[PDB]
A paper describes a structure:
In doing so, we enabled the formation of iminium ion intermediates formed by the condensation of aldehydes with the amino moiety of the pAF catalytic residue, thus mimicking known reactivities of small molecule organocatalysts in a protein scaffold. Assessment of the Michaelis–Menten kinetic parameters of these evolved mutants revealed that the mutations that improved one catalytic activity caused a concomitant decrease in the other, i.e., directed evolution produced catalytic specialization. We successfully obtained crystals for both the RGN and RMH mutants, with one crystal diffracting to a maximum resolution of 2.45 Å for the former mutant and two crystals diffracting at 2.55 and 2.24 Å for the latter.
Comparing the structure of LmrR_pAF16 with the RGN mutant reveals an unexpected change in the quaternary structure. With only three mutations, the assembly of the monomers to form the homodimeric structure is markedly different, as seen in 3D-structural alignments. This is also reflected in a closing of the hydrophobic pocket formed at the dimer interface, where the distance between the two closest atoms of the W96/W96′ side chains decreases from 6.3 Å in LmrR_pAF to 4.0 Å in the RGN mutant. The newly installed R18 side chain forms hydrogen bonds with carbonyl moieties in the N88 and N89 side chains (the latter was also introduced in directed evolution). In one monomer, the H-bonding partner of R18 is E7′ rather than N88/N89; this interaction also likely affects the dimer assembly and hence the pocket volume. Strikingly, in the RGN variant the 2-methyl-indole substrate remained in the pocket for five of the six replicates, with a clear bias toward dihedral angles indicative of the formation of the experimentally verified (S)-enantiomer upon close approaches.
Numbering used by the authors:
A (entry chain A): 4 to 68, 76 to 111
B (entry chain B): 4 to 68, 76 to 119
Write the structure that this text describes.
Amino acid sequence: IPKEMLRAQTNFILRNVLKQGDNYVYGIIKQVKEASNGEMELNEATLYTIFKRLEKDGIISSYWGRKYYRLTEIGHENNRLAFEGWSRVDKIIENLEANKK
Amino acid sequence: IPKEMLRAQTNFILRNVLKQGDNYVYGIIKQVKEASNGEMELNEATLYTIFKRLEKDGIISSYWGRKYYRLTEIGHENNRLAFEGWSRVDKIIENLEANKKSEAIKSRW
């Protein structure tokens, strides 16, 4: 149940949200609550902190509309490599199980 | 380049590797290199850090022949909970895309 694994799962979900296009912090929370049948309510302050860190890192930018955030060009590449990485993970997991079988 | 996400991907692989049975560090590198057609070589240091954390927390124990690692009873439970969590993530993402595709069809019309 380690906190580094819960955080990786939460990062993966945020990555998929920002993949869709521009969003704002309360809209993200709304979307994840509905898509998780209520299981998962992201804390708004935590979300701002993560985003401030991503913004400082050039991964994310923002503009006023409500503040909206969107992936930068560096952010979109970081995301593509992250999803490509998970696809290879998925494929490696299949071959390891076929190899055992 | 997502560095914390690389570590989660390496952790995810290792969990499934240990699920298949006991192993040693370099045998794991071999098996995953074979299972990826040579594309992917796990960094040995990332591997050790994970195993040093898993060993300290009782998820894995080890034995000498070369050091081998095995999932403990606690490890199998931790593992099952990790896969439940990753499975719920997969469904949340599907629900996020079905909901966005729904909003978009209703917005064309």
